[PDB]
Amino acid sequence: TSIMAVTFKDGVILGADSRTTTGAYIANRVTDKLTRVHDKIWCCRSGSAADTQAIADIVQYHLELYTSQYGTPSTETAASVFKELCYENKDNLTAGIIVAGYDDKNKGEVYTIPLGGSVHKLPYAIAGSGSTFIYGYCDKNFRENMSKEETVDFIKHSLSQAIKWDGSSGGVIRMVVLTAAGVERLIFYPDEYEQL
Amino acid sequence: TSIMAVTFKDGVILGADSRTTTGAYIANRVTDKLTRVHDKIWCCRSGSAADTQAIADIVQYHLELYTSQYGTPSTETAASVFKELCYENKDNLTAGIIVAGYDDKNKGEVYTIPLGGSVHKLPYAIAGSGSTFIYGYCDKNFRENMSKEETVDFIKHSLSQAIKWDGSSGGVIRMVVLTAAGVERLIFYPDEYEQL
Amino acid sequence: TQQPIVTGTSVISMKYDNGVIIAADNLGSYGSLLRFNGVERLIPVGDNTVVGISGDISDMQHIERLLKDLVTENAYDNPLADAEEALEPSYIFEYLATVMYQRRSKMNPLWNAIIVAGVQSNGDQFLRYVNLLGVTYSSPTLATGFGAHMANPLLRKVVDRESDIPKTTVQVAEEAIVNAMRVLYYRDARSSRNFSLAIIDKNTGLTFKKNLQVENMKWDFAKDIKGYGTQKI
Amino acid sequence: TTIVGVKFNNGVVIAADTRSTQGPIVADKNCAKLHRISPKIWCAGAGTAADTEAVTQLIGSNIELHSLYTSREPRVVSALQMLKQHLFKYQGHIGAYLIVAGVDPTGSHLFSIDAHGSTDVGYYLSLGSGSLAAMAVLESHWKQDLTKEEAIKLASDAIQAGIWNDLGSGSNVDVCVMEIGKDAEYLRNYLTPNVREEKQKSYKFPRGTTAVLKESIVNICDIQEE
Amino acid sequence: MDIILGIRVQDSVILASSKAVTRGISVLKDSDDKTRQLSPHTLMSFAGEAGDTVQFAEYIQANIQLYSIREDYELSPQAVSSFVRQELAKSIRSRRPYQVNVLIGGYDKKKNKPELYQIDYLGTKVELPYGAHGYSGFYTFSLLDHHYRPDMTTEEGLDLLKLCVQELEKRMPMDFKGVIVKIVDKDGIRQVDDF
Amino acid sequence: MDIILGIRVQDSVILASSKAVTRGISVLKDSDDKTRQLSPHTLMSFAGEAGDTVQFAEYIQANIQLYSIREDYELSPQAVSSFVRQELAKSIRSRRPYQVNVLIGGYDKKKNKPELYQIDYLGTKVELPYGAHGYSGFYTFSLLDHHYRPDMTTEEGLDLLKLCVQELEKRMPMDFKGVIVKIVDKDGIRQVDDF
Amino acid sequence: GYDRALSIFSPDGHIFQVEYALEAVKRGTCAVGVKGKNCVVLGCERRSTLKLQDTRITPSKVSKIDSHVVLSFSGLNADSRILIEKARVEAQSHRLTLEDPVTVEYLTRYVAGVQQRYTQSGGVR
Amino acid sequence: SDPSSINGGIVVAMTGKDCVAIACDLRLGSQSLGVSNKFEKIFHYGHVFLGITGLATDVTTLNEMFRYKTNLYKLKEERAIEPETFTQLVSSSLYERRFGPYFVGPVVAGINSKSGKPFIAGFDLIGCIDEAKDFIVSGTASDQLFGMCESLYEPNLEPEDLFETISQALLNAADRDALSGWGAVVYIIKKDEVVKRYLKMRQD
Amino acid sequence: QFNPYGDNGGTILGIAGEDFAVLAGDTRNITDYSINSRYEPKVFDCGDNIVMSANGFAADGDALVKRFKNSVKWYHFDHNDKKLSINSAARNIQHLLYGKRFFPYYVHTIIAGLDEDGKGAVYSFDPVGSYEREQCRAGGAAASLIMPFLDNQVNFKNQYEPGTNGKVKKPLKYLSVEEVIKLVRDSFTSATERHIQVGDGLEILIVTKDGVRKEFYELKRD
Amino acid sequence: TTTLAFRFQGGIIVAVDSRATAGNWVASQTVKKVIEINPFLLGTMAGGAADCQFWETWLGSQCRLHELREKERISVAAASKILSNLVYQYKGAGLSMGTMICGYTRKEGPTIYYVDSDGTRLKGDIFCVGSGQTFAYGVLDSNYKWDLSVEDALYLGKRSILAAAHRDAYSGGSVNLYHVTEDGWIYHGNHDVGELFWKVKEEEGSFNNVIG
Ligand SMILES: [Mg+2]
Ligand SMILES: [Mg+2]
Ligand SMILES: [Mg+2]
């Protein structure tokens, strides 16, 4: 896994590679790691695929029931529900989740939940095995209030490098854009991002 | 450790942090990891301090005796002597060494010798625990035939990021420049490189 | 039983004539990776107490929520919640100490070392320690992790016993704390330059200082150090 | 154990505490940890006490022979090289952790040595269980261009920090000053801040208190004449 | 404990069990009776882990005595052995299993036949002309395989048993301090007081 | 092997050693002599790991016999015991040590005194009025501590030895198949053929 | 190590070092052996050029190799001690491995073998 | 399993005015089993006295080794070895077995025949010298001995007063150790007379 | 793997006199080679003229003392303010300790006071609740250094009357409170010299018919 | 530890040593290893000190409840079985006991039951438990008769503990004697082993191996 989420002027964008491995065997080369828990609250999953799929399904259930009673939940609320599951079941889980969402009041927000189940609100976040190789690049190149096109380029270039060096990461680069305008899916193929 | 060597138009430059740890305790914050095995053949040391100091002392002895009999050794020859010691004693050693040197015939050359004792000739090399965090940055920013000032900036910026993210790395950034003009030592303090 | 994942390093503290001082850096480490650089590890409770926490950050955030809930609960049906029946440093500590010992007794600890610093109703200085094992103790100076090995020796040179407390001003105490934080930055591989500092005084109340930096560092002498023994160049 | 080394204007000073332990028990209250390699090269040792003494005497012996062979006064870099190569060969099994200091025709020097064979250079160093307490003091009060008096003061203050704060260290401070162009001055028990108070009672027994079965003279003399 | 033997002859079942009790270093007793009467015509000998042996035997005894009072009727040896097997088969998948091996010798008054059942701690039951537990069978079965006849008298059974004990006393490393021998027939249970 | 005992009386040394040899499950022999004559007035009994016991004893025997021929002289019991101790002290830091414990009973013809030496596989030597190896001392020393006198006759020593063996046969779990008893005095070494 | 071939053939097919060793035997005091029907007697000459000798402690000419075999000699006294020691060691080694004392012929064959070996080994006489 | 506590035993040494004292218990055991009550742990080579605690086979071996070495010393030097010199010989001999050591706790006591100065010293199993002015302790009850000596000892005790002090130090320390006791010996050493005293003590 | 236990060092000493009792302990608290506190009280007045100390793992020690103090409070509530006698307190502490037989309080407990005849009393406990009335008992780190000295100087063990040579024992004459305190101070001064975990300070609680008194003395801080 | 108990004409003799050790360190020389369950029943302490103390004073409570409910003295058989059934419930959890439950009733006469933490319950005439048990067995087996007098039986128990105290490193301190009659147990004093050894050596002529 190479996953990241980046806030920008108009909202937030999530990015991910598409490789799922069992040892050195690529069990799925076209995986979708960008997961919808609410209309404009998505997450990036890393760690055990069973665990993170189970957690995301429970969160989606919790936020669907929240919405029926109290209306649209905040991104902070979604992050809290993720945290509760990750913290209270820390002994039995291997999950690293980045939560990203768009409110109209709060705009774009990013929360990262590492292994222990702690929560950290950040302007942008990186996670997965491939993230280690782009801490330097991302820290040097991230700016606040970037445009949509700049943020797409930042994520494309960042995950390109993560894929290049991490054997566990690869395939296509998937992205999901969260703004007031709606939800847009993007995909970028190897022939595009390898020549960057 | 965060160590690197980079070839450029006029020769080669070696760079290193100055932190030596015993667990979380910094046993020396002003260490010199750039070591001279011949007049214009130096190395960067990473791994066990005992092992790499023992290896570098033996290599210096070998090249001093080579010089007395056959004249100035090539950088390739120095790398070979390092390799022989690292390969044949691989069971008992924990050493990751980068060898950098300047000939007049071959100009600047860089060889990296990882744990197993293999040799790899490269335009530039990075090693140590801190190098993981700058694979992305270095790959994106390295160009061949840079100037002295550009190469100093590239190493300063790269090791700055390695220090920022790796707890094992820190202190001052030391550099050694190898050209036809001679040998120049550089040092950069925290107040300088932290604001980059 | 677990293992700590995201962790915070030393918390240091000491008593002075009119109150207490406590400090801790703003780093959240992920092993050797210095992952999170804006983590507040000093958490104030009211205007008379500051709780400093080291160790597991997920557990720290849990304890932070317990303290927030404690303030809410104390205010319930309590007309004197901001006066005679406000939370004391001693109440906050005993509660935490109870929780820590209970959790270790179920073999599921909160993986932390905690220092509660504050001033009581009668003006008395409060400073006490508790950790994942439920072990508690008090001293004129207290420190966790690396701080225990490096900060305490320096802080004990200012206040060596109880009788040194009235002779120690807030200026002398803060100076000592700030110097100790510099020494820890020199020597602890899991520390950062950025830290927070809190003063709780019986006269001037709670002063919370954020975004402090280690300054006046000596590095110049590094330029003369060459090789590891015989090397001259 | 707490040991330190501090460079100054015209030389180098080393210091150490005087407590040796076997677990939690104090074996000797006035132990000598400052060892002489040669007249003007001294080292202080932490770790396995037999090893630090043995490795110092072996290298000291070979340094003396080398000095006689070359007709030159011994150098600190020679002691350092011989110590590190010996310790590397034994792969850390010889548990000697040393601070090596001295003056020679090249100048004044200060090095440390780990048991695995790695060495380092510095203006101020500390080793042993009390090294963190000592280094705290050194990092707080060290400056460039210290005088002899300032360096002795700083070194002993660093040992005191170990004495009072580290349970592995205690009792007295030993100091050795090595100045360029002078005899090295070994100051045994330079500070004595831990004298035991008078006891409340005398425990001298009345004579005949112990029950005895047999008495006999032991012949320590050789076989006699006549 | 150690050696327990059984032999079914023409008209009776004979059980022989060692007398020694050893607490590691010392022999604490040399007159221990490793048997319990379950009903007037049914006897059970036992061997296994300390404590569990007597606890299990007395528990079985209590249950069979309860059945006898409730129905005013003595269960057949086959029925008793089945009850015991089930208890051990239940026990082997418990939190802490009974580590006990038993021999059940009974005279069936309905069929006028002696019967010997061998059951180990797993609940493994077999009906046999002669049986043993532990290492006892390794020394004695070759003698029993040679000399045993289904029409033997009680006296001939005791003589064949003496030959088995003599071979045990010769080749076994442990001193088991002799055996207590008991006979089960149509008249009930009795102990041979000189063996 | 198992039990070896020794007692030094007025005018002789008496060594008692068990006869059993056990290969795990079976007792392979019940008449084994766990002793070697080193010289006409010196006897050594032994116990420890299989093979090493006899190999060590015969090696010592060969060396003392060699000395006797070379010098035409019998070494004193003290001298023989010192030689044996050194061999075991050398052995304990070898690649594969001799796992052998010995008793050395000898009559010194120069001093006209019996002498008993106890040496374990580490090379731990003590001169004693009575001694043992293994668990033998745990059962017998309380009897020897009570009844022993330095002026005992050989017959009184044998009687005290019988009481020791009887206590061993009562409280020891293992059957050691009795003991072979040998007496060492001014006239040499002889075996008591009825014990 | 010293490897020089001291015992070698001469043009007439003689090994002079072996023949000169016999001349040393010719110089030694006389020894005689006679076997009866149920015994063997060994007689030895003592040269009376040496008086003031202590006969209690002076090395005797007949030596026991085992309790049942004896050895006497003529020639170099110091040389004979080496053969006697080797023979005594072999006698005990034979008892240890074969569980039977040496026959007289076996012991003779061993000593004779040692003597032969010293006639075609380098660096020895 | 631990070689230094299989056999048990203790040694203590003390200095006084123009005299030294060294004392030891007499027990040898096989763990719980008491084997001998006559196993003396103090030996002497000329006027130099050596006590040795620990693994009994090594105690015997080292005594034989130092008798060997001090006899050759005397033949070559034409004089008896002194306490200071012997201390260095013990240290050297122990360290040569650095990675396969004798499991012992030696103690040296004696008076220098030329200066008249009282001398004592102790060692760990591998040669490290402890040269105390006051007292040296060794064995399975060394903790207990440290406690006794630290309170009972005072400097410059006369020979007959020193006897009482060291005797009471040994006895009461041994009675709080399962593997020490079964008798005791005390040596009082002056420049040219040495007295040896066996003490009466409980035999459990 | 998580280890629920630790070792906080410390040494305690209880001595029973004819009409008094003392319970003393050093004030130093430690982990490994570090000092946590130079003054952390370890001996506590529990009410009803009873003093207590639970030495070893300080978390368990504080828990046990806290639960016993609570037991004294409820004894008064349930039994008409009856004074809890020292023997009754001892039996009660056994049940508190054995209640955690299979997850023990890692401490060595000592209590002191006066019995119902006014005579001095000291009781000693193992971690799982076995107990004994005793005259003299040291506990903790330096217990092995202190007890042999007390055997010799309180009970006069191995001491005989001069002239008789072992035939007549030194008579066991009663010690005053001043005499006992001298022996306590010398015990801890000697322990401080030879044990690294003992030092900083000595706090003594003295129990008589008049109540509980405290005395504090400095110890070496190295 | 060394504890013994034996049946004879005049009832039961119980004898124990007084030493407790933690490794090589002698923790106490004044340990009470006979537990006074009630005025008629005695128990011995071996294995775990707490386990023996706690559960045998608990046993005293159960025996008191039995006689209140049944208006009759509890039998030694019933008393021993209450304890053995209790420890059997805890089997596997790590209890450590080896004890002799001793009593003298009308229906049974003098009775001794060895009770163990594995669940073992054995009736017998002579039992000996502890690290020094083998030494005490030797003296017992060679001198025991049913027709011993109370005086001679008391000495035999004292002498057997002394034998163990001498040889076993982990036994010693002092000897505690008890004589159990039908009307209850009678305490026969505390005897210091140090003083007792020399007294017995001189008067008996034993221990010639030891110099006195
Ligand atoms: Mg890839
Ligand atoms: Mg004993
Ligand atoms: Mg200290």
mmCIF file of C-alpha atoms in Angstrom, chain C residues 1 94 98 101 104-105 107-109 111 128 132-139 141-142 149 152 156 160-161, chain I residues 1-6 8 29 34-40 57 59-60 62-63 66 100 103 105 218 221:
data_model
loop_
_atom_site.group_PDB
_atom_site.id
_atom_site.type_symbol
_atom_site.label_atom_id
_atom_site.label_comp_id
_atom_site.label_asym_id
_atom_site.label_seq_id
_atom_site.Cartn_x
_atom_site.Cartn_y
_atom_site.Cartn_z
ATOM 1 C CA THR C 1 -1.225 -6.940 26.937
ATOM 2 C CA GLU C 94 -5.878 9.896 42.708
ATOM 3 C CA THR C 98 -6.810 4.325 40.497
ATOM 4 C CA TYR C 101 -3.526 0.294 38.794
ATOM 5 C CA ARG C 104 -2.533 -3.235 35.084
ATOM 6 C CA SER C 105 -4.484 -5.608 37.361
ATOM 7 C CA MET C 107 -3.377 -7.302 32.369
ATOM 8 C CA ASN C 108 -4.463 -4.562 29.941
ATOM 9 C CA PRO C 109 -2.489 -1.437 30.868
ATOM 10 C CA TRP C 111 0.963 2.291 28.379
ATOM 11 C CA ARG C 128 3.191 13.402 41.827
ATOM 12 C CA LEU C 132 1.418 1.838 33.580
ATOM 13 C CA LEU C 133 2.134 -0.357 36.650
ATOM 14 C CA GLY C 134 0.200 1.916 39.044
ATOM 15 C CA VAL C 135 3.442 2.896 40.809
ATOM 16 C CA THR C 136 3.262 6.350 42.436
ATOM 17 C CA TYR C 137 5.787 8.693 44.047
ATOM 18 C CA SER C 138 6.463 12.359 44.843
ATOM 19 C CA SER C 139 9.661 14.433 44.844
ATOM 20 C CA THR C 141 11.667 17.224 40.920
ATOM 21 C CA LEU C 142 9.988 14.569 38.729
ATOM 22 C CA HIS C 149 18.228 9.973 33.724
ATOM 23 C CA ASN C 152 16.546 15.068 37.297
ATOM 24 C CA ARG C 156 18.132 18.399 41.699
ATOM 25 C CA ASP C 160 18.026 19.091 46.298
ATOM 26 C CA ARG C 161 15.643 18.745 49.267
ATOM 27 C CA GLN I 1 5.129 -9.161 26.787
ATOM 28 C CA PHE I 2 3.632 -7.057 29.604
ATOM 29 C CA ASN I 3 5.106 -7.567 33.088
ATOM 30 C CA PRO I 4 2.589 -6.523 35.789
ATOM 31 C CA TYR I 5 5.291 -6.457 38.510
ATOM 32 C CA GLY I 6 8.207 -4.179 39.380
ATOM 33 C CA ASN I 8 10.903 -0.375 44.083
ATOM 34 C CA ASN I 29 12.216 4.764 46.161
ATOM 35 C CA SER I 34 17.539 5.438 39.130
ATOM 36 C CA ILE I 35 16.174 7.244 42.189
ATOM 37 C CA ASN I 36 12.474 8.097 41.953
ATOM 38 C CA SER I 37 12.317 9.891 45.291
ATOM 39 C CA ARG I 38 14.633 10.552 48.242
ATOM 40 C CA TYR I 39 11.635 10.946 50.576
ATOM 41 C CA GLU I 40 8.664 8.656 49.880
ATOM 42 C CA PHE I 57 6.468 -3.572 44.530
ATOM 43 C CA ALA I 59 1.916 -0.245 43.671
ATOM 44 C CA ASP I 60 0.882 -3.472 45.422
ATOM 45 C CA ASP I 62 0.122 1.070 48.491
ATOM 46 C CA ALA I 63 -2.921 -0.998 47.471
ATOM 47 C CA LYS I 66 -5.037 1.305 51.559
ATOM 48 C CA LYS I 100 -4.949 -12.868 45.662
ATOM 49 C CA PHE I 103 -2.104 -13.187 41.393
ATOM 50 C CA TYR I 105 0.635 -8.724 46.058
ATOM 51 C CA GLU I 218 19.387 11.557 57.385
ATOM 52 C CA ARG I 221 22.524 10.123 49.471
#
